[PDB]
C-alpha cells in the first residue's frame, strides 16, 4: 500500500455495527459491521460467499467480525393522473431515516404527509385513516390501498374482505337454506386476440433499401433473408 | 430534477397513468471508511539502483510483498524519458493496494 | 365384470398459479451508484426505461389475472367454520385455527424463505433473504394477505357443502357434511342400501385414507415435487439477478469501482460499455423468461379456476379429469 | 438488422402459436356456451349463463354473455325428503328444486329464485327411504 | 491408493476460504486411487556397533519431469512394525523419515557416464537433525574428484549418511552434519540466498506439497496449522528466478548398528496435473471431502 498520514479515526471498532466503505488493503467495497463467531481458517482472514463476496473477517487483534452488505432502503412511488397527487413508499423498514442522507438525484417533498408505519414498511405522503375499500384500483401491496380526495389527499385504507352472506346449518331433518329473491341479467364481457396483422418483408428493401454496394455485400450473406 | 422528472422521462410525455412504480431508490451515506491491515517494513527499491544495470535479456527481477511503497520518493528522482502504461491508468499505480 | 370390494384413494396434484411478481431498478442494478456510470448511462438508457414498464405491465397483468380468479372463486355466500364440523371425520387438519393445520404443516415441510415482507431490511441489519438487495431488486409483496386466502379457503370450504347438490349456483345448500357425502355417493352410483346400513366402515376407512396422506408427505408425493421445483424455479430466477454481476462479460474485471479508479477514462468507458451491454442482454433474457412464466401462469390459473369450479365444488362427469378412479 | 429480424421471427412464431391457442379456445367458446348453455360453473359467463353473443374484431373476437345474476338473498328453510310415515319407501325428491315450508307446508321451488309453487308430479320423482328424511301425515302431497 | 472423498493431500485455495458449501475450482490435482512414485529409505551395513558401507538403491539415477510439482505423504507406515529393508528376516517399529530434494533444469551424464548431471544454479533442500531442520539452498554444486567421488573415479551413486548415536540425540544436533555429508560429496559456490525452517516432531503422518509459478516456488504443508488436521498451507515461498523442469531424490543413509536396526518410513510421491475438483467446505472450514471431474 502507499504511504499515508495514518488517521486514528478510521478503525474498525469506531463504527462497529454501522455502514462504512470498507477497504482492507485491497479488499475494497462498502458494507455493515457485525460481531460473529469465528468460522473458517483464521490465517486466511477473508471468508467469501458462493458469489465471490465477503461475508466474514478475522480481525488483526482477533475479534471475528462479519460484513454482509450495506443494504439501503428500497423506494417506490405512487402518482395519480387527473388528481395531482403523489407519495413515496419504503419497503419493510421502520420510519428511521429523515431527509439528511440519500443518494442519486434530488428528492422532492411537499408540505408536512409524514413517516407512517405500515406492515410493508414506512410511507411518506399518507394520512392515517382506518378505511376499507373492496375494489381499490391502485393498491399499495399486502392488503393496503390509498384513495384520493375528489389540493386533494390520498387517504389510507386496507384492502377489504368481501364478506359472504353467512348462513348456518342445522343438525336435524330440518335444514337451513338461503335463496335469491331478486335478480338481473349481468353481461360477462371479454375479448380475445384471434389473428394479428400478418406482415412480410423484402430482403433488399429493408436491408439494401436500394444499395448497389449493399447488393454486392449481401450476396455473401445470401440465403439468410430467404 | 425530481421524482416526476424521472417519471415523465420514462414515459416521454406530459401525461402518464396512475401507478405504483419502483422509483430509483437511494443509498444511505456510509459512516466512514476503514483502512486497516498489517504493515511492517517499507518497500526497498535499492537493488534497482544497485549494481551493474543488466541487459534486456538479463532483466533482473524484484518481488515486493508486505511492504509500503511511495512513488513520490521513487519516481520523482527518476529522470523518466518515457512512460507508458499497458491496460492500466498511470496515475493509480501509486494509489491502490495489491 | 364387477368389483366386490372398494376403498378411497387420494390423488395429489398442484398448479403453479401466481409467479413471483418482482421489480428491478435501472440505476441501482445496472449502475450500482457510480458517477461515470450515470454519465455513460446517459449514452444509452433507452432499454432500461422501456423494459421497466414492460415488466410493470406484465406484473399488473398477472395482478389482474389474480384478482379475476379470486373474484371468480369467491362464493357469494358461505358457511361458518367451527371445530368438530363434518361429523366423525377428522377434518381438523383442514380446519383453520386463521391458519389451516394442513397448510401449516405444508408450509413447515416446504422450504419457505419468505423475503422479509415485514422485517427484511431490518432483518439484514440485525443479521439470502437480505440478498434480495445486493445489486438490487424487489419481489413485491402479495397483493393479498394470509388471512385473505384463509377467507377464500373458508369460502370454498362452504362451497364444498353448498354446491354439489344440483347444477345452478344461485341457491346455496351447505348440507351437514356427512349427509352431503351421502348425497354425493348416491349421485355417483352407489346404492342407497349400503349407504343406509354401512356408513360406519366407509367413514372409518375414509378417515384413515385422509390420515395416510398426512404421513405420506415426503419426496414420494409428485405434488410436493412440483412445489419444490417451482421453488427452485423462483431460486434460479433470482439467481439470474444475483449471479451475473460476478461475470465480467469479457471485461478485465466485474467490479465497477475497480474499473473507474484503476483504469484510464477511455478504456474504462469501453469496459463500462461492455459491462452495460452484457447486463442489458441479461435483462432481455430476464424479460423473455418472465414473459414465458407469465403466460404459463395465466394458462395454469385458467386451468386451476376451471378445476376448482367444475370438479371441486361440484361433481364433474369427465372421466378421471382431476381424480383417478371414480372421483 | 439480421439479428433484429431473427428476434422478429422468434416473437412472430411465439405470437403464431399463441394465436393457435387462441383459436382452439375461440372454437371452445363459440361452440360450448354460445351455441348452447355450458354446464360449467362460470365457464364463459359468470353465474348461471343464459345466452352468449360473439362478434369479430380486426385482430380478435368479442364476447358478451348474458347470465342470471342473483341479488337480495333471504333466509329460508328446506327439507330433505317428503316420505310417508306409514310407507317410508314412498318418498319424493324434487327435479332440480327445493322444498319450502310455505304459508297460506313444503312446496316446490326452483333452484335459483324465490319462486314457490304447489308441489306437483311434474317437478318431483320417487326415491328411496332414508333415516334423514321427513314425515308428513296431516296433508300428504299428491 | 489416494481417496479424494477422504481428501488425501490436495491443494487448498490460497486466500479464498469458504464454509459449509460445495465449490468447484480449477487448479493442480492428481487422479483418484493412484499408485505413486514409491521410494523408501533404509540403514547401512553394520556389525556390532560400527556401521560399514552404505545401503542405497538406484533411485539417484531415476529422473522425472517436474510438470506441476508433487505431493508427498510421510509416515503412512508409522506406528507399525515392518521388516527391516537391509535384513528381511529382521523386523522393527516403523519410524517417520523425511526426504531431501534437488531441483534444476538440465540433464547430463556423470563422470562414469550415468545420466543425472545438473548444471548452473540449482536448488537442494534437506531435512536434518531427526527432521527438525528443513534447510534449503539455491546454489552452485561442485562434484568432488577423488575416490568414489561424483567427478572422480570408482563412483557409483551419491548418498548422505547420518550417525543417530551422535547426530540427533537429545539436544546437540551435530551442527547439521548431514549437510556436511552432502558437503562430503559436493561443494557450494556462487550462492545467492538461503532458507532454514524449524519443524517439531510428532507421530501423526505428514502431507507436503511443492509447486512453482513465475512469482516463486510455493511449498505447502499441514503441520504449521493443521498438526492434528491436514491441508496445504503455504509455509514457504522461494523467490525463484527460473522455472524448474527436472528433479531428483537424494538417497540418505543412517549409521545405525546391526542389532538395533530400526524400520523407517515408506513415503509416496504423487504428481500434480491441471484438473478441476469440487470441495466440501464444512462449517469449521476443514476440507475433508473432495471429488474429481474427469
Ligand atoms: C499413531 O498413534 C497416535 C496415538 O498416540 C495417533 O495420534 C492420535 O491421532 C488421532 C487422529 O487425529 C487424534 O485424534 C484426534 O483427537 C482430537 C483431540 O485431541 C486433543 O488431545 C490432544 C492430546 O492431548 C491435544 O494435543 C489436542 O490439542 C486436543 O486437545 C480430536 O479433537 C480429533 O477430532 C477432530 O479432528 C478430526 C480430524 O480433523 C475430525 O475428523 C473430527 O471431526 C474432529 O474435528 C481427533 O479425534 C489423537 O488425539 C492422537 N493422539 C495423540 C496422543 O496425539 C497418531 O495419529 C498415529 N499415527 C499414525 C500414522 O497412525
Ligand atoms: C386428527 O389428526 C391429528 C393429526 O395426527 C391428531 O392429532 C394428534 O393427536 C395426538 C394425541 O391425540 C398427538 O399425540 C399427535 O401429536 C397429534 N398429531 C399432530 C400432527 O398434531 C388428532 O388426534 C386426530 N383426531 C382424531 C379425532 O382422530
Ligand atoms: C318417519 O318416522 C319413522 C318412524 O319409524 C322414522 O323411522 C325411524 O326414525 C328413527 C328416528 O327418527 C330412526 O332412529 C330409525 O332408524 C328410523 N327407522 C328406519 C327404518 O330408518 C323415519 O326416519 C321418519 N322419516 C321419514 C320416513 O322420512
Ligand atoms: C451446514 O450445512 C448443513 C447441511 O445443509 C446444515 O444442516 C441442515 O440444517 C437445516 C436447518 O436445521 C436442516 O433443515 C437440514 O435438514 C440440515 N441438513 C443436514 C444434511 O444436516 C447446517 O445447518 C449448516 N450449518 C451452518 C452453521 O451453516
Ligand atoms: C465480539 O464478540 C466476541 C465473542 O463473540 C460472541 O459470540 C458471537 C456469536 C456474537 O454473538 C458476538 O456478538 C458475541 O460477543 C467477544 O469476545 C468480543 O469482545 C466482541 N467484541 C467486542 C468489541 O466486544
Ligand atoms: C391509524 O389509525 C388506526 C385506527 O384509526 C389505528 O389502529 C392505527 O394504529 C393507526 N396507525 C398508527 C401508525 O398509529
Ligand atoms: C327487483 O329490482 C328491480 C329494480 O330494483 C325492481 O323493478 C323489481 O320490482 C324487483 N323485483 C323484486 C321481485 O323485488
Ligand atoms: C375389502 O378388503 C379389506 C382389506 O383387504 C377388508 O378389510 C374388507 O373387509 C374388504 N371388504 C369387503 C366388502 O370385502
Ligand atoms: C530454531 O530454533 C532455535 C531455538 O529456538 C533457534 O536457535 C534457531 O535459530 C531456529 N531456526 C530457525 C530457522 O528458525
- List chain B residues with CB under 8 Å of C267: 87
- Decide whether any atom of ligand 5 lies within 6 Å of the A34 Cβ: no
Report the alpha-carbon distance of residue E220 to residue E9 in Å, rounded: 10
- List chain A residues with CB under 8 Å of E288: none
- What phi and psi values does residue C286 have, to the nearest 5 degrees? -60, -45
Considering only CB atoms, B18 lies closest to which of A79, A89, A105, namely A79
For residue C267, the Cα-to-chain-centroid distance in whole angstroms is 46
Instruction: Enumerate helices (H) and strands (E) in chain D, giving the number of each.
Output: 1, 9
Cell numbers representing residue A27 in the block:
479488499
* E245 to chain B, closest Cα gap in Å: 20
Q: What DSSP element (H or E) covers E189? A: strand E186-189
Nearest CA in chain B to E242: B61
Instruction: From the CA of E135, give the closest atom in ligand 9.
Output: 13
- DSSP for residue A175: E
The residues in A 187-216 lying below 8 A from E, measured between CB atoms, are none
Using DSSP's 3-state secondary structure scheme, residue C275 falls into helix
Cβ contact A124:A109 at 8 Å: yes
For residue C187, the Cα-to-chain-centroid distance in whole angstroms is 33
Report the alpha-carbon distance of residue C240 to residue C56 in Å, rounded: 18
Sort strands D61-78 and D48-56 into parallel, antiparallel or unpaired: antiparallel
Task: Name B80's bridge partners.
Answer: none
* Number of alpha carbons in the 13 Å side-chain half-sphere of residue D69: 10
Going from the C-alpha of E84 to that of each of C176, E13, E39, E49, E227, the distances in angstroms are 91, 40, 15, 17, 28
Cβ contact B24:C136 at 8 Å: no
Nearest CA in chain B to C134: B27
Report the alpha-carbon distance of residue B10 to residue A222 in Å, rounded: 40
* E18 to chain A, closest Cα gap in Å: 6
Nearest CA in chain C to D129: C192
- List chain E residues with CB under 8 Å of A41: 17, 225, 233, 285
- List chain A residues with CB under 8 Å of B6: 105
Task: Name C23's bridge partners.
Answer: C138
**Which residue from E198, E235, E236 has its CB within 8 A of the most atoms of ligand 9, so it is best to mutate?**
E198
Please tell me if residue A46 touches chain E, with a CB cutoff of 8 Å: yes
Q: Can chain A be said to touch chain C, i.e. do they have 3 or more Cβ pairs within 8 angstroms? A: yes
Experimental method: cryo-EM
Report the alpha-carbon distance of residue E208 to residue E65 in Å, rounded: 18
Q: Is E190 left (phi over 0), alpha (psi -120 to 50) or beta?
A: left
Please tell me if residue A47 touches chain E, with a CB cutoff of 8 Å: yes
Query: What's the E21 CA to ligand 4 centre distance in angstroms?
Result: 11
Report the alpha-carbon distance of residue A138 to residue A146 in Å, rounded: 7
Cβ contact A36:A65 at 8 Å: yes
DSSP per-residue string spanning E23-61: EEEEEEE--SS------------EETTEE-S----SGGG
Go through C32-44 and write b for each residue having 16 or more CB atoms within 10 A of its CB, e for each that does not: bbbebbbebbeee
Report the alpha-carbon distance of residue E158 to residue E136 in Å, rounded: 18
- Decide whether any atom of ligand 1 lies within 6 Å of the E249 Cβ: no
Query: What's the A32 CA to ligand 5 centre distance in angstroms?
Result: 16
Instruction: Enumerate helices (H) and strands (E) in chain B, giving the number of each.
Output: 2, 2
Go through A93-124 and write b for each residue having 16 or more CB atoms within 10 A of its CB, e for each that does not: beeebeeeebebeeeeeeeeeebeebebbbbb
Q: What DSSP element (H or E) covers D77? A: strand D61-78
Q: Please report the resolution in angstroms.
A: 6.6
- Residue closest to C317 by CA, chosen among C306, C308, C327: C327
Is there a contact between A46 and E15 if contact means CB atoms under 8 Å apart?
A: yes
Please tell me if residue A39 touches chain E, with a CB cutoff of 8 Å: yes
Burial class (CB in 10 A: 0-12, 13-18, 19+), C72: middle
Cell numbers representing residue C264 in the block:
484510464
- Residue closest to E162 by CA, chosen among E275, E99, E284, E252: E252
* A22 to chain C, closest Cα gap in Å: 13
- List chain D residues with CB under 8 Å of C192: 128-130
Go through B52-87 and write b for each residue having 16 or more CB atoms within 10 A of its CB, e for each that does not: eeeeeeeeeeeeeeeeebeeeeeeeeeeeeeeeeee
- Decide whether any atom of ligand 2 lies within 6 Å of the C92 Cβ: yes
For the CA of A61, the nearest ligand = 5
Report the alpha-carbon distance of residue E265 to residue A67 in Å, rounded: 47
- List chain E residues with CB under 8 Å of B61: 241
- Residue closest to C206 by CA, chosen among C13, C6, C12: C6
Report the alpha-carbon distance of residue C171 to residue D116 in Å, rounded: 14
DSSP per-residue string spanning A124-139: ES-B----EETT-SSE
Instruction: From the CA of E229, give the closest atom in ligand 1.
Output: 39
- Residue closest to C145 by CA, chosen among E200, A160, D104: A160
* E119 to chain B, closest Cα gap in Å: 18
The gap between the terminal CA atoms of chain A, to the nearest Å, is 61
Going from the C-alpha of C122 to that of each of A65, A91, C115, E29, the distances in angstroms are 19, 10, 12, 44
Amino acid at each position: 500500500c502507499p504511504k499515508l498520514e495514518f488517521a486514528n479515526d478510521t478503525k474498525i471498532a469506531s463504527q462497529l455495527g454501522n455502514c462504512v466503505e470498507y477497504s482492507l488493503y485491497g479488499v475494497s467495497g462498502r458494507g455493515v459491521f457485525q460481531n460473529c463467531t469465528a468460522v473458517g481458517v483464521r490465517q486466511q482472514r477473508f471468508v467469501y460467499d458462493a458469489y465471490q463476496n465477503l461475508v466474514g473477517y478475522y480481525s488483526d487483534d482477533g475479534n471475528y467480525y462479519c460484513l454482509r452488505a450495506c443494504v439501503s432502503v428500497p423506494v417506490s412511488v405512487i402518482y395519480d393522473k387527473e388528481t395531482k397527487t403523489h407519495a413515496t413508499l419504503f419497503g419493510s423498514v421502520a420510519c428511521e431515516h429523515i431527509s439528511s442522507t440519500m443518494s442519486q438525484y434530488s428528492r422532492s417533498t411537499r408540505s408536512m404527509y409524514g413517516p407512517l408505519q405500515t406492515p410493508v414498511g414506512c410511507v411518506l405522503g399518507l394520512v392515517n385513516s382506518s378505511l376499507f375499500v373492496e375494489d381499490c384500483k391502485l393498491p399499495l401491496g399486502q392488503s393496503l390501498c390509498a384513495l384520493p380526495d375528489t389540493p386533494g389527499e390520498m387517504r389510507l385504507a386496507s384492502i377489504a374482505f368481501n364478506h359472504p352472506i353467512q348462513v348456518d346449518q342445522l343438525n336435524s331433518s330440518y335444514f337451513k337454506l338461503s335463496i335469491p329473491t331478486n335478480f338481473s341479467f349481468g353481461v360477462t364481457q371479454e375479448y380475445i386476440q384471434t389473428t394479428i396483422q400478418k406482415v412480410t418483408v423484402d430482403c433488399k428493401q429493408y436491408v439494401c433499401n436500394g444499395f448497389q454496394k449493399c447488393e454486392q455485400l449481401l450476396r455473401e450473406y445470401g440465403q439468410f433473408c430467404s | 430534477f425530481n421524482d416526476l422528472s424521472q417519471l415523465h422521462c420514462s414515459y416521454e410525455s406530459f401525461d402518464v397513468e396512475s401507478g405504483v412504480y419502483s422509483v430509483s431508490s437511494f443509498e444511505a451515506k456510509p459512516s466512514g471508511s476503514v483502512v486497516e491491515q498489517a504493515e511492517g517494513v517499507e518497500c526497498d527499491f535499492s537493488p534497482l539502483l544497485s549494481g551493474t544495470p543488466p541487459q534486456v535479456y538479463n532483466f533482473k527481477r524484484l518481488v515486493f510483498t508486505n511492504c509500503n511503497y511511495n512513488l513520490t520518493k521513487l519516481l520523482s528522482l527518476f529522470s523518466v524519458n518515457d512512460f507508458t502504461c499497458s491496460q492500466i491508468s498511470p496515475a493509480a499505480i501509486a494509489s491502490n493496494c495489491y | 365384470s364387477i368389483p366386490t370390494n372398494f376403498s378411497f384413494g387420494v390423488t395429489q396434484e398442484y398448479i403453479q398459479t401466481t409467479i413471483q411478481k418482482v421489480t428491478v431498478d435501472c440505476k441501482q442494478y445496472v449502475c450500482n451508484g457510480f458517477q461515470k456510470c450515470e454519465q455513460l448511462l446517459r449514452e444509452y438508457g433507452q432499454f432500461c426505461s422501456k423494459i421497466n414498464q414492460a415488466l410493470h405491465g406484465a406484473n399488473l397483468r398477472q395482478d389482474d389475472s389474480v384478482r379475476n380468479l379470486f373474484a371468480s372463486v369467491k362464493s357469494s355466500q358461505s358457511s361458518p367454520i367451527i371445530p368438530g364440523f363434518g361429523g366423525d371425520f377428522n377434518l381438523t387438519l383442514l380446519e383453520p385455527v386463521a391458519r389451516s393445520a394442513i397448510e401449516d404443516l405444508l408450509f413447515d415441510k416446504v422450504t419457505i424463505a419468505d423475503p422479509g415482507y415485514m422485517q427484511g431490511y431490518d432483518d439484514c441489519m440485525q443479521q439470502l433473504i437480505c440478498a434480495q438487495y445486493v445489486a438490487g431488486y424487489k419481489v413485491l409483496p402479495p397483493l393479498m394477505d394470509v388471512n385473505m386466502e384463509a377467507a377464500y379457503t373458508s369460502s370454498l370450504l362452504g362451497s364444498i357443502a353448498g354446491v354439489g347438490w344440483t347444477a345452478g349456483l344461485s341457491s346455496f345448500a351447505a348440507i351437514p357434511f356427512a349427509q352431503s357425502i351421502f348425497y354425493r355417493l348416491n349421485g355417483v352410483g352407489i346404492t342407497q342400501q349400503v349407504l343406509s346400513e354401512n356408513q360406519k366402515l366407509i367413514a372409518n376407512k375414509f378417515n384413515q385414507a385422509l390420515g395416510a396422506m398426512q404421513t405420506g408427505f415426503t419426496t414420494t408425493n409428485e405434488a410436493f415435487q412440483k412445489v419444490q421445483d417451482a421453488v427452485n424455479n423462483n431460486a434460479q430466477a433470482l439467481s439470474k439477478l444475483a449471479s451475473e454481476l460476478s461475470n465480467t462479460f469479457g471485461a478485465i474485471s466485474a467490479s465497477i469501482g475497480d474499473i473507474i479508479q484503476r483504469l484510464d477514462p477511455p478504456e474504462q468507458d469501453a469496459q463500462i460499455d461492455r459491462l452495460i451491454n452484457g447486463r442489458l442482454t441479461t435483462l432481455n433474457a430476464f424479460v423473455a423468461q418472465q414473459l414465458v412464466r407469465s403466460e404459463s401462469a395465466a394458462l395454469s390459473a385458467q386451468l386451476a379456476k376451471d378445476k376448482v369450479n367444475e370438479c371441486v365444488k361440484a361433481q364433474s362427469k369427465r372421466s378421471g379429469f382431476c381424480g383417478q378412479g371414480t372421483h | 438488422r439480421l439479428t433484429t429480424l431473427n428476434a422478429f421471427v422468434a416473437q412472430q412464431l411465439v405470437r403464431s402459436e399463441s394465436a393457435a391457442l387462441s383459436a382452439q379456445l375461440a372454437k371452445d367458446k363459440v361452440n360450448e356456451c354460445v351455441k348452447a348453455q355450458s354446464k360449467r360453473s362460470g365457464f364463459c359467463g359468470q353465474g348461471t349463463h343464459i345466452v352468449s353473443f360473439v362478434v369479430n374484431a380486426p385482430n380478435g373476437l368479442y364476447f358478451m354473455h348474458v347470465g342470471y345474476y342473483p341479488s337480495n338473498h333471504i333466509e329460508v328453510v328446506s327439507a330433505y325428503g317428503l316420505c310417508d310415515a306409514a310407507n317410508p319407501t314412498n318418498c319424493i325428491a324434487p327435479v332440480n328444486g327445493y322444498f319450502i315450508k310455505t304459508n297460506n307446508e313444503w312446496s316446490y321451488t326452483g333452484s335459483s329464485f324465490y319462486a314457490p309453487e304447489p308441489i306437483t308430479s311434474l317437478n318431483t320423482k320417487y326415491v328411496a327411504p332414508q333415516v334423514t328424511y321427513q314425515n308428513i301425515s296431516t296433508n300428504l302431497p299428491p | 491408493p489416494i481417496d479424494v472423498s477422504k481428501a488425501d493431500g490436495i491443494i487448498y485455495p490460497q486466500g479464498r476460504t469458504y464454509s459449509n458449501i460445495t465449490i468447484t475450482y480449477q487448479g493442480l490435482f492428481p487422479y483418484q486411487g493412484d499408485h505413486g512414485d514409491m521410494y523408501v529409505y533404509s540403514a547401512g551395513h553394520a556389525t556390532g556397533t560400527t556401521p560399514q558401507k552404505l545401503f542405497v538403491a538406484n533411485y539417484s539415477q531415476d529422473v522425472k519431469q517436474f510438470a506441476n510439482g508433487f505431493v508427498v505423504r510421510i509416515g503412512a507406515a508409522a506406528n507399525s512394525t515392518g521388516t527391516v529393508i537391509i535384513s528381511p528376516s529382521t523386523s522393527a517399529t516403523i519410524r517417520k523419515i523425511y526426504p531431501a530434494f534437488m531441483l534444476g533444469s538440465s540433464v547430463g551424464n556423470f563422470s562414469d557416464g550415468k545420466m543425472g548431471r545438473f548444471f548452473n544454479h540449482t536448488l537442494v533442500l534437506l531435512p536434518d537433525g531427526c527432521g527438525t531442520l528443513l534447510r534449503a539452498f539455491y546454489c552452485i554444486l561442485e562434484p568432488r574428484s577423488g575416490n568414489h567421488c561424483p567427478a572422480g573415479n570408482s563412483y557409483t551413486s551419491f548418498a548422505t549418511y547420518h550417525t543417530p548415536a551422535t547426530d540427533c540425540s537429545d539436544g546437540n544436533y551435530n551442527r547439521n552434519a548431514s549437510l556436511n555429508s552432502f558437503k562430503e560429496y559436493f561443494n557450494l559456490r556462487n550462492c545467492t540466498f538461503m532458507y532454514t525452517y524449524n519443524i517439531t516432531e510428532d507421530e501423526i503422518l505428514e502431507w507436503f506439497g511443492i509447486t512453482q509459478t513465475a512469482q516463486g516456488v510455493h511449498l505447502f504443508s499441514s503441520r504449521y496449522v493443521d498438526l492434528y488436521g491436514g491441508n496445504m498451507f503455504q509455509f514457504a515461498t522461494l523467490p525463484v528466478y527460473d522455472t524448474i523442469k527436472y528433479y531428483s531424490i537424494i538417497p540418505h543413509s543412517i549409521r545405525s548398528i546391526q542389532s538395533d536396526r530400526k524400520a523407517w518410513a515408506a513415503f509416496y510421491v504423487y504428481k500434480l496435473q491441471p484438473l478441476t475438483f469440487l470441495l466440501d467446505f464444512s462449517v469449521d472450514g476443514y476440507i475433508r471431502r473432495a471429488i474429481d471431474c474427469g
